[PDB]
Design a protein around this nucleic acid. Structure first.
Ligand SMILES: C[C@@H]1CCO[C@H]2Cn3cc(C(=O)NCc4ccc(F)cc4F)c(=O)c(O)c3C(=O)N12
Ligand SMILES: C[C@@H]1CCO[C@H]2Cn3cc(C(=O)NCc4ccc(F)cc4F)c(=O)c(O)c3C(=O)N12
Ligand SMILES: [Mg+2]
Ligand SMILES: [Mg+2]
Ligand SMILES: [Mg+2]
Ligand SMILES: [Mg+2]
Ligand SMILES: [Zn+2]
Ligand SMILES: [Zn+2]
Lengths: 47, 66, 261, 242, 261, 47, 242, 66
DNA sequence: CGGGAAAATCTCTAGCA
DNA sequence: ACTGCTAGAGATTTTCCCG
DNA sequence: CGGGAAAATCTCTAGCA
DNA sequence: ACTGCTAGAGATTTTCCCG
């Protein structure tokens, strides 16, 4: 599995670990407390 | 018949990018066109390219020039 | 390292020392020290250093608003060509945007529009218009303008041209139309040395014409191929390689170990 | 290179234009153009028509691209010079527009329209437009119920006319047709620019007299001397600018 | 081209068409078309695509202010090492800055300070303090932070560390001191795999020691050199090349055509 | 001689032509109506 | 490599430390350290002293780096644990601080100071400081007229003491001296880390018994067997981790 | 005498940049030090560098390592 | 001399506001 | 007459280590 | 095959706000 | 399941052109 940490929506605070659902080029779909988010890969880190 | 249509296909130039490289790769020959993928020949190297990553022109200047 | 590890983790709690400082000060292999970092939620602060690439298909348009002398300019760009289209609108609303979009759909083939999430773009009237014109709508990741970097960049270029010609016209609506003229027909560069106007003509005409030709080719050229498998459909052959399409998967195999039937 | 004589014979027999002679016999378009221009017996993309129509007490300005049948139309509030000027400048920014044909009304002759035409480099010259206003009105009537305001209905009609109606020889829409026509015009003006660029040189081959240059390929130099097109090697000739 | 030129200039007045569009549409050589652009004041809008480089000498410090939870943090970095120094100050004033600067001057050799033009930095009391400590002051080009990019970047890194440790302390002044600790001693990287603390020790010690050694070398090794000229002073020889200093100009000449006296 | 065009001090409006006085790496000294300015080379164009 | 025997003789004669044996005879510092550590007959950078002094009714906290004579001093408003803690954490961030020597006062024994020491990894252990308070007071008296407030005078005194006063053997200031001492300490702990890193291996040469590793150069492998340092070629030996 | 001091000089590493290149050029040998310029040897290539563009260290780790 | 794994180096990014 | 930089993530190339 | 000049290509930047 | 880009300035390399 993967832990995802991310910044999203103008909030300069990194959150996570979120579950990775999908990885494209340039963006990821992650899940964070039942809240599915779409994050640019510039703004995420997969571990 | 078929050879004329195929040589027409191969007259169109393809500008494309690879999944991670931001520079547009110089003009390549078009071999085949799909709904999702164009098959190209770039410098004696046949490659498959998602359609969202390819600009297909005729290059009217070059054509008229010969 | 069972001793160095226990010490490095304790110190990393206080300090959040990076992996090199922990390798140095506790005699740890890089992978072990890095493992200590990778497991600290408080040290996951930097995104990966890459950029994505936008969809450049001949049907995709990027739209945005921009602002100049207290007025709203609606801008659109055919991503493939660089060809633009802008109008001063009275207000940033879904009514203006749906009307602008209906006009654009009637002048060019518009298959997909990509926008930020400004409320004018997510409004219900824009949805109804895109539905009526057959336009698929894409919204970027919120607060990620890079997603529609093409149109954001075109806002830059349109405002610069407007600055160059602002004084030849009196009202901003006129300067804006002058600027669209200039961009689309008096500025050459990019792939074919084209102006954007010529380039979009070439893109759309090529799209039509290649579609027609490849259609006729698939109508005549009908064969099956076997390689290494099943009856894969032939797409192209020549130069000692065969391009096939097996189960909606296009692969380039050499002429050896491939027989055309 | 070797097919120049075949092309000359084909032109003497069938009077085929340069496009066919260059597509079939694999010649640079300058050479086929010279062949088709060396025979005396063998001897629109920018023209738009503007008119203001009326519907439900509102005013619609209509531009038809004559060669294509492709329409740009909208509701303008008032039939003035300012509004015509703004519509025209919009069209000019969107499509290559060289000549506008209007009907000598008050708006189409205004100073402001003439200023716009001078800025955009358009020439004003004071049947298709009537029938086409008719067609557009029919489509507006068909789609009127589909919107609340006439302007939106107008734009829907324009969409339908340009892209959802196919007729003529090849069953193309007006939008496909206009894109074809404009592409052909671009090829034509590329060719004319090429001809202009190379018409300033003079060649000397084998040294013979001054010949007119036609093409400077990678392995040859195609010239024209005494109404005859001769292919000479590059090393055997010398091109100078006069 | 006397015809094409006259037309291109007239059209460039209306449109400001770039050089390629003018070369294309008037049959002009690139240099002529580009000349038309270069002579239009309305087309001089883009700066050259380069970056400068900041002074990295062992004596230069970059100073700045930054802001966190409604408080003013004064930050300094020895540019050569990356070694920092920060204190929460009650107000952005020349009094706080002169006091901070006197302290820093008494702890490390401070030869030059480089700052933006914030009024605390241009105040008269900071001038009097720098004069008393022998500190030369440099101010960047106004509104060009890149000039002191090192310290601007260090503001970034200090705030990120403060975020990592904010909860171990109660007051921001303490978290700030913790963060300076962490940066200077618990983070290795850069040139020698050092922490900034070790690196500044090495820079300053090397500076002292090389100064002393080269002094002794110039005291003993005394010769004159002739090459190609005058009696140039020898600096270094070996490996078939001689490095001389002729009229305050250091040039590397090969051993051939060079005689040492 | 040289014409210098430049942007300076937060003003997004390019000015000039100014006389070039000095060219370093990264910056220029120019003169513009008796007003000597120092401009980063990123923000100037010398002609 | 060839100078190991010369170095052994030099140590037997003069008992020279490893620094000289490695600077003169060109040996890796691990090897010279082994030589100086193989002879039984041949057998501070982090220690600071803190004290609170008084002047003109104000309170000055003073840190002396014992080895160097280098001072960090300031006026604190009150002689409390919080203020001592903040001063100490500042010093620790600025200089490698391992041990602090204080005088059992109320502030130096506070919980908050002890919390700061635990966070920074400092050890608290409850003559130079008295004489040095004296010197600092003399300099403060010399420069008092040069400022309005005592805190600025204090910082000037500190500047003067650390950088504008030279004495001792080589006529160095305290700042130069402390930079030297800390650099020496860094070399020392690099060396200890190197020794620790390589003390976990075992070598077999020519196969003989297990020898202790000292250096793994590019053209040799220096080992130690039976209190004897032997240089063997790399291909002729095999190093394993135990 | 002199040779010892010169070999000490040449023990210090120089990190430097060229007038236009932002990457720091890897460790070079120090030959000579001036008030305005350090003379280096980087990969059998002697170069002169303004002092404002050079970081001169000992590399204590490398030194102790040997 | 040959791969595998490990170390080193190169490429690129946000935030400094 | 002055001037972007830092440090981390991930990719790519060099180095080393037992055959 | 050889330089010079010219054209093409590569590298990098601000602004989009 | 989505994603920086553009166009101009200046430097650097490729191309061509008369020997
Ligand atoms: C009133 C004082 C003096 C005059 O100007 C203002 C405004 N200012 C603005 C920034 C800023 O925009 N940083 C972003 C950034 C952008 C690019 C880059 F390379 C580095 C960067 F840090 C500062 O950092 C800063 O200290 C100030 C400040 O102090 N002042
Ligand atoms: C309320 C709507 C919807 C939600 O967000 C806001 C705010 N916003 C902000 C920018 C902006 O920050 N551009 C600078 C930029 C930075 C990087 C890059 F790659 C490209 C760039 F253009 C826009 O352009 C923009 O259109 C909007 C907008 O429309 N809205
Ligand atoms: Mg927007
Ligand atoms: Mg925008
Ligand atoms: Mg500031
Ligand atoms: Mg700042
Ligand atoms: Zn951590
Ligand atoms: Zn202009």
């Amino acid at each position: 599995n993967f832990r995802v940490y991310y910044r999203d929506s103008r909030d300069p605070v990194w959150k996570g670990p979120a579950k990775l659902l999908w990885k494209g080029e340039g963006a990821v779909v992650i899940q964070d407390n039942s809240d599915i988010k779409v994050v640019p890969r510039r703004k995420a880190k997969i571990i | 018949e078929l050879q004329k249509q195929i040589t027409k296909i191969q007259n169109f130039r393809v500008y494309y990018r690879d999944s991670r490289d931001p520079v547009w790769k110089g003009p390549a020959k078009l071999l085949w066109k799909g709904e999702g993928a164009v098959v190209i020949q770039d410098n004696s190297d046949i490659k498959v390219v998602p359609r969202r990553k390819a600009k297909i022109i005729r290059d009217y200047g070059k054509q008229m020039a010969g | 390292f069972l001793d160095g590890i226990d010490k490095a983790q304790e110190e990393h709690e206080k300090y959040h020392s990076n992996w090199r400082a922990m390798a140095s000060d506790f005699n740890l292999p890089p992978v072990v020290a890095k493992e200590i970092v990778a497991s600290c939620d408080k040290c996951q602060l930097k995104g990966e250093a890459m950029h994505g690439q936008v969809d450049c298909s001949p049907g995709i348009w990027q739209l945005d608003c921009t602002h100049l002398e207290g007025k709203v300019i609606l801008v659109a760009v055919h991503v493939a060509s660089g060809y633009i289209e802008a109008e001063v609108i009275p207000a940033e609303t879904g009514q203006e945007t749906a009307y602008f979009l209906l006009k654009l759909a009637g002048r060019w083939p518009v298959k997909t529009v990509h926008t930020d999430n400004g409320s004018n773009f997510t409004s219900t009237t824009v949805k109804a218009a895109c539905w009526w014109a057959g336009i698929k709508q894409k919204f970027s990741i919120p607060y990620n303008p890079q997603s529609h970097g093409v149109i954001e960049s075109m806002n830059k270029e349109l405002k610069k041209i407007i600055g160059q010609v602002r004084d030849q016209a009196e009202h901003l609506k006129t300067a804006v139309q002058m600027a669209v003229f200039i961009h689309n027909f008096k500025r050459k560069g990019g792939i074919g040395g084209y102006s954007a106007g010529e380039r979009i003509v070439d893109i759309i005409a090529t799209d039509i014409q290649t579609k027609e030709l490849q259609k006729q080719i698939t109508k005549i050229q009908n064969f099956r191929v076997y390689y290494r498998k099943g009856p894969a459909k032939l797409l192209w052959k020549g130069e000692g390689a065969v391009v096939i399409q097996d189960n909606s998967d296009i692969k380039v195999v050499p002429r050896r170990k491939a027989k055309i039937i």
